[PDB]
Amino acid sequence: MTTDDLAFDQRHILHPFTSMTSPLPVYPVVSAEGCELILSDGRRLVDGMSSWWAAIHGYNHPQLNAAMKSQIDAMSHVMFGGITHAPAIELCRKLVAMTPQPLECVFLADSGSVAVEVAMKMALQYWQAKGEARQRFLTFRNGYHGDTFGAMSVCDPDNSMHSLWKGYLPENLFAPAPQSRMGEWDERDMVGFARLMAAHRHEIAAVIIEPIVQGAGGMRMYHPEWLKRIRKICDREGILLIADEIATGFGRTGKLFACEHAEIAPDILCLGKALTGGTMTLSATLTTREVAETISNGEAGCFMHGPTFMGNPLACAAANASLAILESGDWQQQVADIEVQLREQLAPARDAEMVADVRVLGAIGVVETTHPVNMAALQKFFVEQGVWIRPFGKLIYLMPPYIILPQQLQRLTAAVNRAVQDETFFCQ
Amino acid sequence: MTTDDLAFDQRHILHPFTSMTSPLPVYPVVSAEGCELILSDGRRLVDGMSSWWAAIHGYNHPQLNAAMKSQIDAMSHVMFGGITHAPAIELCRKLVAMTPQPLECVFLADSGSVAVEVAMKMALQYWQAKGEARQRFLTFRNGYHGDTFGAMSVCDPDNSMHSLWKGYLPENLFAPAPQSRMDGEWDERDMVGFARLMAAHRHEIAAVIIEPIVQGAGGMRMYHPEWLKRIRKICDREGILLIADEIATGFGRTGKLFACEHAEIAPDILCLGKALTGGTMTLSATLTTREVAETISNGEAGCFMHGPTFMGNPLACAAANASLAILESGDWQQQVADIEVQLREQLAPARDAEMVADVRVLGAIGVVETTHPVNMAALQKFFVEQGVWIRPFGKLIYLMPPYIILPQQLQRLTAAVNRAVQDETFFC
Ligand code: NA
Ligand code: NA
């Protein structure tokens, strides 16, 4: 990559949630291997982010690579309308088997946001078929479910800046963010959620939440008793429960799916990110026979959705290989050890002036700061320390690949602790 | 693939817009090469569909394969937050250069529907930044723009069954479907409906969104280019943004590189997908102007508020680059022109068949509209038996073959279509 390549990127290529008028520096990556990213200048960075949850097995994984190349040799893509193929069948077999018993019907899609849209549409079509006027969703404040319009309608109105779209987005119900920490249960935490359910139980199509960990909305970690109760309340009212595990799925919190922390099963489950081992985009929405059949027996005679690249053989083959790595069970002890090391190594941030809170769960470590980070200065600092850590707002957090070496994880935690010692890298 | 595999697929795997209770047969594909799909059982089928537009270069293309394998060796994926890479830069360079001059800022995404959502959000954020209360979209009937909530809100209300979501979807403006034909003559009576809507709703319209020249999923309609000229001028005069959805028409399918070229106009926002990667895997792009991109970044949010996890996916970008490189030869023009002449000549006899209502051809798109709905299971079996993969829908039996299709292969397709419509056997 030439300097001119970088200049073109700056003036012509949009990046996630960042200004085109006041763009901040981006770092050119040429390749990646193991748990490291390699910059154009040759510098190697220990990846602390897993490219946002997904790369649970790191980069250039020989098994993932071989499975992808082998599927390319057969066919990278063929349409799924009137056609099926081995990669999709193998993936759906695994997904059905590894999730709770009732979840046995799979709708594959391309991205997390679309998977949520699918889940929401399932809930709406389900009630339409039953002849019930139910079009509201009940969710938690500080939640995040994606950027398409349906998903946006259940995201935190504040974090997701709903004022920008006031009048376009449907108005859903937002219960207070769960207070009880992943800590002791306080029954008073339920008063808000209960109030909403009482006033709106008749019109709620589904409850949608991120189980245990609220990611993009604040990297919050709450008590599993919340899920147990929500499941009981939904059962009681006949309301569908949608669990968005696009971030928590596939071992990240210490259990295969975060719903396990409460031994609960949702009616609808959304999966993405780590599904393919972070090699390429793919998502899945699973639901029950009751939901799937009810929908097909309604007026449309089917579930009204079908993306062009649905069931993409290549992505399915990548996901199959990624799931096969997890089948060994090694991730269990890898995450447990990462959790101990995160707890042990981030503890000192509790003595730092710029820190508001420290919390760890599984292979997730979060240092919340008192002031917003200076994105440009702090990103450069991390790069200079030989690590790739991507902060945002008042959060400096780590979600490393499960295969990360202890000395690599240590470089990450040391960098985090050094960043929070004084006001140098803060505000802007 | 065993019969047990096929049973599992039927019981547990949803497919595009089809029942989970009364599913029709799906054919197992094991591989694909050139212009052929290879069924598990060994039968080879000439592909007439390009897996829904996308596979313009066919299957197992050497250049696409090589580019994909090479990228896997470097990195299949890395996050785009704070990072850039060669595949993304090379792809965006190509997209900026090949599209009209004003289109110089690129937002990469995962799927066509997401690209449309991005375009819609760009329009909404644009006006919000300018302090204008514009939230409505003006579109045309028989339009199709994707399956997510925003996209659905601009799809034809009859075809997409908007009654399922009445009360959830925002209510947009729908001008009559364009009547003047691409083969035929311009009738100024065509404009009254659109003019009436614009005059009455000008001040609240954020953007006009249309599929240029060909309305795909909404009826495989082919309308006169004067429409686009007129719309562009009206938008220019009223200060309204024009979104061209070229997710199906892009990259040469209608005889020109982009269908907008037929009217020699450029939109403010351009959506691309399907054939972008040569139909190897999912990827999309939304291009806009500097005026739009900068205005949004100068507003409240300080940026365009979108950023999918797999944004800029290196692997998909490498595939798209290889696909565009093939198109750079200019060869597609002659290929598409030849396909067009053969389609016109060989579908012509179908105009005399009792079961045919209309025959229309444009570029590498050949359509035979019938008087009655086709019998999906029976007609699909017929086509497979003739050694062709043609996927009909409703009253439409259409062809959109890979540009590399041989004349003999194309003849098998047209022969099969003509035979399918000579009597009512495969109808109702
Ligand atoms: Na299951
Ligand atoms: Na351009």
Side-chain angles (χ1 to χ4, degrees), chain B residues 13-184 186-293:
Chain B
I13 304 183
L14 276 69
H15 286 253
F17 295 90
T18 205
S19 173
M20 276 305 278
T21 47
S22 161
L24 299 179
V26 290
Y27 295 81
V29 176
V30 294
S31 69
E33 59 191 44
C35 210
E36 303 179 84
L37 306 182
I38 297 157
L39 298 187
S40 283
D41 78 5
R43 292 174 295 173
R44 307 177 69 83
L45 310 177
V46 175
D47 181 33
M49 310 309 298
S50 294
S51 290
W52 286 321
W53 311 90
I56 55 170
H57 311 302
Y59 305 88
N60 249 297
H61 193 289
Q63 290 178 250
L64 300 180
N65 286 1
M68 286 165 87
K69 287 188 196 208
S70 289
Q71 192 50 47
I72 284 167
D73 289 343
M75 48 184 195
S76 197
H77 183 66
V78 68
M79 58 186 277
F80 215 44
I83 279 172
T84 190
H85 48 75
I89 296 167
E90 292 300 315
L91 173 61
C92 293
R93 274 197 173 338
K94 285 184 167 75
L95 294 175
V96 170
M98 73 197 300
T99 49
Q101 222 274 318
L103 296 171
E104 60 172 294
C105 299
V106 190
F107 190 98
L108 296 169
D110 327 296
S111 71
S113 269
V114 171
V116 164
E117 299 264 340
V118 161
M120 295 177 75
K121 284 174 80 175
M122 282 178 169
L124 293 176
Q125 260 198 95
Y126 175 77
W127 292 116
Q128 197 277 346
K130 303 204 111 226
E132 270 171 53
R134 294 177 181 269
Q135 284 191 138
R136 293 197 88 182
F137 291 87
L138 177 53
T139 187
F140 286 142
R141 285 188 189 268
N142 283 279
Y144 174 73
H145 292 110
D147 313 321
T148 52
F149 281 115
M152 284 202 286
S153 75
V154 288
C155 291
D156 182 272
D158 310 292
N159 274 338
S160 317
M161 298 196 57
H162 278 186
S163 60
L164 290 170
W165 338 101
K166 181 161 287 138
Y168 200 72
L169 281 181
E171 289 168 4
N172 286 309
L173 304 161
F174 294 88
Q179 274 130 21
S180 303
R181 284 166 75 107
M182 176 74 207
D183 318 3
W186 175 251
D187 198 347
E188 267 255 35
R189 230 194 122 207
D190 222 349
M191 288 298 312
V192 340
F194 185 89
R196 173 167 35 238
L197 283 169
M198 179 62 71
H201 294 96
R202 57 171 37 100
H203 292 130
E204 42 173 354
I205 294 166
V208 170
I209 178 158
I210 65 191
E211 293 160 272
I213 310 306
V214 180
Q215 294 184 292
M220 294 299 290
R221 303 176 86 263
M222 300 171 179
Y223 64 86
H224 201 292
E226 189 63 27
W227 258 109
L228 294 183
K229 280 179 208 252
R230 293 309 180 78
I231 285 174
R232 174 71 279 171
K233 293 182 266 214
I234 288 165
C235 289
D236 288 345
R237 245 80 286 140
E238 306 281 352
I240 293 164
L241 298 176
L242 173 62
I243 300 163
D245 183 349
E246 293 223 37
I247 289 159
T249 58
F251 307 112
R253 175 69 64 186
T254 68
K256 295 215 153 252
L257 190 60
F258 297 102
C260 282
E261 291 185 23
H262 277 111
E264 307 170 336
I265 62 102
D268 295 281
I269 302 168
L270 176 66
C271 301
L272 304 171
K274 296 205 178 74
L276 177 58
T277 63
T280 48
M281 64 188 87
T282 192
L283 187 64
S284 66
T286 299
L287 287 82
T288 194
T289 62
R290 200 133 223 119
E291 155 77 8
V292 167

Side-chain angles (χ1 to χ4, degrees), chain A residues 187-340:
Chain A
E187 203 68 41
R188 182 177 185 90
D189 210 358
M190 283 288 328
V191 186
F193 184 99
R195 180 153 39 238
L196 290 166
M197 181 62 70
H200 301 280
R201 73 190 131 127
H202 67 291
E203 50 171 1
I204 291 172
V207 164
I208 178 167
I209 60 192
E210 294 161 271
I212 309 309
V213 177
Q214 294 189 294
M219 294 299 279
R220 310 180 77 269
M221 300 163 174
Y222 66 84
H223 196 304
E225 186 63 24
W226 261 109
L227 297 180
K228 289 179 163 154
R229 306 287 250 254
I230 299 174
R231 179 71 274 174
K232 280 38 254 182
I233 298 160
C234 286
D235 286 353
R236 210 167 23 236
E237 308 289 351
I239 289 165
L240 301 176
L241 173 55
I242 298 164
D244 183 350
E245 295 223 32
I246 289 159
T248 54
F250 309 108
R252 179 63 66 185
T253 68
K255 287 201 190 295
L256 190 60
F257 298 103
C259 279
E260 284 180 30
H261 287 290
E263 293 168 319
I264 242 76
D267 295 276
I268 300 165
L269 177 66
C270 303
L271 304 174
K273 298 200 179 44
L275 177 55
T276 66
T279 50
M280 69 195 293
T281 193
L282 188 66
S283 69
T285 296
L286 289 84
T287 191
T288 62
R289 202 106 233 144
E290 147 79 337
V291 168
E293 291 187 358
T294 293
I295 285 166
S296 280
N297 291 338
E299 308 161 6
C302 72
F303 174 56
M304 293 283 287
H305 211 112
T308 301
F309 289 94
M310 185 174 189
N312 178 61
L314 177 57
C316 285
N320 283 335
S322 177
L323 294 177
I325 297 167
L326 292 177
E327 274 167 2
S328 79
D330 294 1
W331 67 267
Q332 316 184 238
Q333 196 60 225
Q334 283 172 145
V335 169
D337 293 337
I338 288 165
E339 187 177 63
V340 172

